[PDB]
């Protein structure tokens, strides 16, 4: 959800496997459908 999907254009809950509706947010799990290389550039944070 935070860093990005591990496959290409897939989401965590197993739905939205198709490439056509890219750039949308899944309702079940919130994972943006996009490339797997975005996990090389997306960071989060820890609140202390």
């Amino acid at each position: 959800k935070i860093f990005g999907p591990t496959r290409d254009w897939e989401c965590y809950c197993g739905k939205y496997k198709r490439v056509r509706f890219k750039g949308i947010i899944c309702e079940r799990c919130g994972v943006e459908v996009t490339r797997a290389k975005v996990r090389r550039e997306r960071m989060g944070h820890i609140e202390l």
Binding site: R18, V19, R20, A36
Partner: protein, 87 residues
Amino acid sequence: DSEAVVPADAVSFTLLQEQLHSVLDTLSEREAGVVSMRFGLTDGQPKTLDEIGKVYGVTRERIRQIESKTMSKLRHPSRSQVLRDYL
């Protein structure tokens, strides 16, 4: 890493796309049109034989007959070496 893109694979994919467009242009215009929609080659969505029977206006019998004729024509060994190695 298995997720790393292989340049040979991408070159093979784009050449497969170009050669598929070329062999589609090789066939007749109407046959190219009907095959472009059966597997939805033109767009991201394939279409059924009843779905294309309204815009073009033919029976299920005739549309599946010309479809199977296109598959048989592409199944001929002449138009195979351009695609057999492409798997």
